[PDB]
Write a protein that binds this ligand. Structure first.
Ligand code: NI
Length: 222
């Protein structure tokens, strides 16, 4: 499981989404280097303009790339599910607004780590922060709390994210996350701990399509 992540791994992401009826797709390619906890990825909205802000999509758009320090390698659930993979399900509640519901499969396809996702968004306000496109194009750092869930043979994960708005306030998002394996094979069920994540968003100046360039570093602690 862990031996598939010793070098640079290529990554592919495929998202089909539906938010308040506005349908879209996003595709991403990049690579991940789990020894350093590094991800570099470029995403394109392939159906035109993206109907929600790119920041709301980041957490949906591969925690198996987290750097687990040596003293904690016995708590890396995500790499232990590989190569067959795990299913990731979330509900994300945006305070005073709507919510996303997501299901993704993460697994190897030959050499490539694949993250295939379905997303549904309901109850968003036409003039709210999301559909109204009022979020800044940036990303704060976060702690992602991970607990075992032994009766689903996986893990439960919860965190909040704070998205900046031009007026100084924030849009809060509360994530609730269940990961479970795809295989009938062994996995590691960790002790409680968290992931510390840093993310930088930017644009390719030679790209005319609606896109996002993403640099992420993720580290396990606690
Ligand atoms: Ni930090």
């Amino acid at each position: 499981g862990e031996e598939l992540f010793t070098g640079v791994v290529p990554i592919l992401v495929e998202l089909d989404g539906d938010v308040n009826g506005h349908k879209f797709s996003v595709s991403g390619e990049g690579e991940g280097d789990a020894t350093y906890g590094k991800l570099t990825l470029k995403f394109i909205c392939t159906t035109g303009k993206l109907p929600v802000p790119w920041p709301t999509l980041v957490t949906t758009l591969v925690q198996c790339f987290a750097r687990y320090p040596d003293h904690m390698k016995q708590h890396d659930f995500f790499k232990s599910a590989m190569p067959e993979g795990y299913v990731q399900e979330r509900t994300i509640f945006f305070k005073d607004d709507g919510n996303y519901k997501t299901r993704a499969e993460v697994k190897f396809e030959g050499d490539t780590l694949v993250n295939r996702i379905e997303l549904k968004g309901i109850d968003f306000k036409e003039d709210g922060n999301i559909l109204g496109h009022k979020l800044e194009y940036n990303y704060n750092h976060h702690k992602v709390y991970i607990t075992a869930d032994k009766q689903k043979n996986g893990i439960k994960v919860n965190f909040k994210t704070r998205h900046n708005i031009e007026d100084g306030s924030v849009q809060l998002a509360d994530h609730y996350q269940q990961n479970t394996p795809i295989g009938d094979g062994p996995v590691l069920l960790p002790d409680n701990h968290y992931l510390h994540t840093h993310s930088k968003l930017s644009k390719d100046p030679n790209e005319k399509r609606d896109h996002m360039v993403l640099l992420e570093f993720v580290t396990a602690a606690g």
